[PDB]
Symmetry: T
């Protein structure tokens, strides 16, 4: 019954902070992951993070989550938001509640970005708040408990 | 430069907790508003709340917000999410950043609910976390500062 | 357990009988309301009527209906048929059965009129029979009892 | 000038009351037809009823209606509501006013059911009131006279 | 190798000339059929005509056409133009060339009338010329020979 | 509790093997029906077959199936796949499980063929395997038992 | 027979000139209204102006216009352009000719802005000319007389 | 009151018979025009023909037709069928009845070809009969007289 | 810096006043052009007018406008409103501000007329005011200066 | 010329039987694969099975199939049914006939599931029969031989 | 068998280099045409160039190309890309292979620009490379030989 | 500042030349890659090539390109053209200009192929020229320098 959070980052999230740290932003996925680990450790929770450009790596992580003791998922599918029925179906199959996080406002970009294969089965959605969205996701899990 | 939050609740949100407190939920808008006031007072912020079934009352509140010193808006347009171009245009006109909050998962209901007149100009979106979404909205404003 | 009917008339229904009584029709909302009151009094029922050009006035009336003892609603949303998610959501929230009435044939007019925010949650639909539709609505409630 | 009503029932309406009389309903088409005959006889009217699974049988009945002295039609096209341009065109050709009746709420089912080949040329529409819709149709014809 | 024409008339074409001979037209299907027979007899051709309100009767006639020696079909599907995949598929299966005839302008009516299940496999299309369209169809067959 | 299969063939299936036995195929509906009868007799099952170009004949057969002791239906609606809401509704009303069979690949033809009024309520779908699809349907029923 | 103009301004038009008078514009609704009054007084006409964020206030003003002697309406529905069937239906019901005015180019903004519930029943349309559009509307009424 | 036919051929019709006379066809526009002239002279009619690749040349010819005494137009807009609102509007403006002729089956080609800017205002439509369509058009005009 | 207006009239505008001067209107393009010339001469402006049924003639006139000293364009594209990307692109390329004028209400006609290739790059739009729209266009240019 | 079947299972099919064996089903992919191997060995055929959550692994298996001697493919693309153009194009490129198998009824789920990138190039389709679909696929290959 | 290239430039391409040579570009159509002539002369080829704002001039040039000995066409339809079925049909009729060239990225502009009446019958497509696209087109023709 | 080209080939491009070298083509990816290397070496450029059936391998290559010194990308996404938002977003994130190359005409195939997730952010597009498209891409990069 210990809270165990899997944080899943989709493709290209490894690039956070690389190009034009001035214009685009200086926060790195490593910085985000360290901060989520602390916030989860602070609460007495397990947390592990995985980023992948590979759909199958994220699907494997979801498939393995139940036997690893995962209770909650925090997912930023990034590009896969609009494409990955495989990851949607892995989430539906293991039935672990997940919060969908987007750094940016997906409603203010190309029209195709407005469609999510996740939003109808998500247990919550946080967008447009940058990297703070992940910490708010953990806040959301905590505030339920 | 003091943080002043306007919390705006759209139509039917006054009914929270009224019918079948067992099945639907027992939390009341009054309880939500008291909790947001405390959380804002805790941080040294001003906060005022307004619920209305009337589009014009919400539009007036937005129009008046700038001269009242409002810095941030937390908005749950409820039904008006899908209908109120007037409220969208009042938000665009006064250019105060707002976070869009929905209690429920709007992606898991009637198809018409998936369209928001707010999501493309919102500074953040929090859905499907029940009444906790409002407190997370305040958390989001705080975490920026 | 006494039958209490709320009759709700949407915008512009106050104009019935005003302009070109020859071409358009001479029956007035006041005449309709008097006739529904008699037909309800005849059956030992309570009935009250409200017309409004204001969405919030109709929503308030629905919100207040349960504590007023209303058992059935007869609703002619008129223009709001195509626009008012707020009134739909107030009806869904209080869960009082309603019959949707239209004077005219909404299928024989502008294409946008064919969409109703009410027809999928209505307990019955009567259109194209003019003012007689309201009395048939009362007949429908009676014939269930 | 005597009122002569043709009541037309489309495919599958013969099955009313057959399967799971508890869950689905116990009223039979024969019971409906007997009740409409009485209500019409009560008013001094002619009434005849025809059910068919065959489009051509319903079309023939409409084509023959004028020379039989039919003044009004009450039509439940059932499945043909969404498919039968032939029956629509037979109704348009003989120009006898008809009331469209549906037992169920066609707006609360599969999306394809929301389209009617009849609603734009009907003289009235009654849905979602079960078998009472037919008697209300007769009430509607009477209330015009 | 003798030219044998099957003329097929769809539903409601039996009503030609019945109602308001002044406004709508006085020509009858019997008159059309007599005229086509003469024009075909004049040329040394076989011709037989069939009208039906029944899809299956028209489909049977097409299925039987090849063994009857039919070389050409003249088809006015009327309402079935927009609905009868069965008749389309019977025409495709027997591979007898057909000319599609419409009395009226199908492009100047309800939007649904603009779709034909026949026009993409027809060997010719004649519309909007009234009953003369059938005689022009025979002219078209002749002018090929 | 004896397995009784009704095999229903839609319009134009009587033409199998008639035209260009070389190009199109030489197997006849009579040959298919004889083979299904043997395969069902082999298993100790009842089986009866009906083909019709008439929608009402297929609907009648479904309506009558329950009192005849039918346990399973094998249906090739052919053209009616895309048109017959009446047959869909007869299948839904009698609630006998059916397997939908198509000889051809309906996804590789005209776009309109991709829509089935049957696929969402079918208990199985077999397409593109020619006449073998029917025998596989019987195999599917057997393999459940 | 004296020309009496009602000028109706929709939601948010009260904000003209408030925020960033440099970038957005310095002209105020009060300035526009004073200028229209002068131009109408100059011509010997009555003119009254009403702005409202409330749909029902604009609908009431239209409903009351005929008995007030209004001959012409100049309407800037602003956000209601895309939403208010109630105001459209009030204009249709009182049958006073109206000119639709937009300050901005509605065709050069969000796609949803291209739809007007007014343009098909307007007696004229003037867009993209800023506040001058209202004075041109009065010019248009004058130039007819 | 003498019948005067203008035959208008759209772009690329000058190429008839040029490339691969074997595969595509050997009939030339000059041959068609000579044949229509004879058939019109035979009947005591005036006929003139014009082909153009230029929209404005065809529009000018329509604009000039009334003062030239033209009573009927036979039009093959070819590519302009799908594009030329100018030619449609010239035909509507001069209100001379026209028959729309297509050599080919426009329903059996690219999807965009199924749309005609002419079919809803044409006095008749003849397609898929090759060059014979023009002579049938003259037959159609004659058969009206 | 002298105001030089090019007035461009699209196809069929030469026909104004020709057919049924009673029903359709008696004003001629020549009368409109004389009136615009006077109104421009009155203000000390240059004005030249060109009507053409030819897209290329209007495009040439726009291309030549800058070196001719044109400051403003008044354009009635008529049929080309819905078709001429070439004229749109010529206007965009020379970047002279234009006002789009339509005599009629394009929103109250065929659905295809609601689309303009001009409205999103126009500096103003005036419709439904008949020939007065052109003079209002000149008024609009003047009122800016 | 020996029959060699490649059975390809898409993402998440490894989870069969894992979660709630009571509600969802107890059959495992390992059980399915053992049964297909036996049924193929029984017939003297080669069969190999591969499941992958990785699109590239399935594409590689198809690319390699021809040189491995594969004659037939049985494919359950699962989530990739709706997404994998790469796998479709690998199947088209190697031109080995495949049968598409789905455990569930894809027509009775989310609307997006109704689209297959495989159904138009499949040599057969079997859906909604659970794990028996794979054995029926082998039956289908056998029944061709 | 000598390579003879026709280079066709659509409307507005004559304006290249005219307005704001700094921002938009300084290369002129005359410069492009001189460069293509040299590159073709270099290879021993014939080349002629034609620009026109007139659809009929481009169509005439295509119609005349075969008898002039043209082997290849390089076409920049510019605005006509989205509108000219006449030019498409002239290219299809003469069956000379053409390469479609666009200076700009048509996928990165207004949505309507994404549709080409040429791309499905082109022998190649080069976009977004500015004036270099034409020289690459010649390179493409050469590299085939 | 040395030109370094990354050539990326998507799924199934490894199969070039494998099956039916006569019908489909004999050129192999290895032959293409050798030719691009020579052409780049000829110009003093670096070039490396990567083909993958795996989306993540192509995304990794793009992510790594900037630190490897890549200046230009030549990309043939093949099937991923229509599916890979991940690869689009990797290209957008590293902001290296890319030319999109397709061997075939994507506009002349299945409708779904007409959509590219790349064309709106590409620096150029070359299609339908077979393997020569890649060499033209290098020509395009050179011709800019």
């Amino acid at each position: 019954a210990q809270i165990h959070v899997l944080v899943l980052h989709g493709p290209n999230l490894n690039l956070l902070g690389r190009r034009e740290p001035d214009h685009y932003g200086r926060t790195t996925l490593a910085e985000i992951d360290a901060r989520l680990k602390t916030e989860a450790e602070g609460r007495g929770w397990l947390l592990h993070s995985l980023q992948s450009n590979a759909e199958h790596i994220l699907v494997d992580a979801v498939q393995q989550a139940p036997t690893q003791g995962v209770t909650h998922i925090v997912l930023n599918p990034a590009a896969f938001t609009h494409t990955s029925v495989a990851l949607r179906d892995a989430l539906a199959a293991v039935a672990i509640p997940f919060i969908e996080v987007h750094l940016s406002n997906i409603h203010a970009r190309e029209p195709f970005r407005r469609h999510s294969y996740f939003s109808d089965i998500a247990s919550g959605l946080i967008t447009g708040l940058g990297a703070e969205g992940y910490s708010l996701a953990l806040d959301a899990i905590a505030r339920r408990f």
